[PDB]
Swiss-Prot record, chains A, B:
It comes from the Bacteria. The record marks 12, 147, 153 as: Important for catalytic activity. (S)-2-haloacid dehalogenases may be used for the biodegradation of halogenated substances and their derivatives which are widely used as pesticides, herbicides and other industrial products. It is an enzyme of class 3 (hydrolase). Catalyzes the hydrolytic dehalogenation of small (S)-2-haloalkanoic acids to yield the corresponding (R)-2-hydroxyalkanoic acids. Active with 2-halogenated carboxylic acids and converts only the S-isomer (or L-isomer) of 2-chloropropionic acid with inversion of configuration to produce R-lactate (or D-isomer). NCBIfam families: HAD-SF-IA-v2, HAD-SF-IA-v3, HAD_type_II. An (S)-2-haloacid binds at residues 9-10, 39, 114-115. The gene is dhlB. This is (S)-2-haloacid dehalogenase.
Amino acid sequence: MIKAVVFDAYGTLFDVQSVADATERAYPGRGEYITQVWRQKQLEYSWLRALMGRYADFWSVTREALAYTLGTLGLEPDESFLADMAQAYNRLTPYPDAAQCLAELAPLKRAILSNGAPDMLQALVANAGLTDSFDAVISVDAKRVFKPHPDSYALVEEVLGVTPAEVLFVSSNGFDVGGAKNFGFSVARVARLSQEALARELVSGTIAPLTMFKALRMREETYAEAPDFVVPALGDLPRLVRGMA
Amino acid sequence: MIKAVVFDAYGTLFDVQSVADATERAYPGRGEYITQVWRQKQLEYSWLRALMGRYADFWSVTREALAYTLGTLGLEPDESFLADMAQAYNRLTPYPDAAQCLAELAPLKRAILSNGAPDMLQALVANAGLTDSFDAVISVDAKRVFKPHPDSYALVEEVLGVTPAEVLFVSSNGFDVGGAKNFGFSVARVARLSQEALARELVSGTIAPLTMFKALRMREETYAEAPDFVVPALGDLPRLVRGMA
Ligand SMILES: [Cl-]
Ligand SMILES: [Cl-]
């Protein structure tokens, strides 16, 4: 039976697009671009560092990704600037229905499994006012790998004492849905972009950069096992779990 | 001393853009989009499968990435169509100065180390008429991992019997440059996109797709160790090696 609901953090509980005003105010006219590449390279670097066996925590990864992104524009800000701007990732706005969702899941164990470094996650959750909505906020850091490495998901049992079969893993990220399924969790994917809308957007004329990100990041990955469930929003989760087992 | 020059294949010896006319058929008006997302997802899938510990050779990866890409456009091609169109990757055009480069690099050992599956590389190299330019064409398939996993590079000493220090690794891919430096090779990066041109391109009003691919794929990655050498083209390597020794 499902004894725990484990949440992916970035893109799932928290909007990664919500760094837009900071990236934009900091560099006018370049906000949307930076927001997309920052996230894309943040992911790529987590995968590439882990696959090289050269781990560094998500805070270092987040700042490396930012430096690369600003670099593409011809900017070379010092470490102090990068650390300050990177704080934006610790202030992501939670999705409007995250709190209500977590409230309705109170009977079950509630947790986060994230690539985020310990201090990042704490700040992130505390600033969202969701600290009291979780029995555990788990960082992959202890394992010194990143998703979808199996060791990242092994932490769930270690911390909560529940078996993979008793876990419902929630994520808006294809790669993370694939990792959790591979490891043996039941998965609910959060799909906020309808496939039919993307298809039409991709042919609505000249393809914008924001649509590029969506095309790379907001779909199920073809190499990955399909999720057990797909909901359009977090608020649908409580009800999904009700009529589940 | 440099006893062998080991080349990255895709993007380095072979133009991944040269699938343009094949994709422009799979969907007139969208060949450029497909070309770019296909290559991007092809790379992501190689990283994610390996990191997940669920290897499938580059031929499956190539097809899965193509299916994903076409799927974003709303198409649902069958296996036969995918396998047929994916052949475009075994017909990539070598860069105009590749042959000359390889010739002038003899009698030094010359080899390919590529993510490509064995039959892909053989067909790709044979179509380009470069079979007699290489002492060995090495696929990572033997290790059942993908770059930048260290085992990928370990094959080089196994096949050529040269130590990492005796290898000059050539690649246009920042993640491959990073993995080879990580492993211990000396590395010559082929940088066909000037940083200053990209920076300005990203500032010139609306940002095109190819530009998005370029921003994501044609730079040195910030987490990676820098390459020992950077040249503009393959033809510059023979001279690099000479002035090097
Ligand atoms: Cl993430
Ligand atoms: Cl490759």
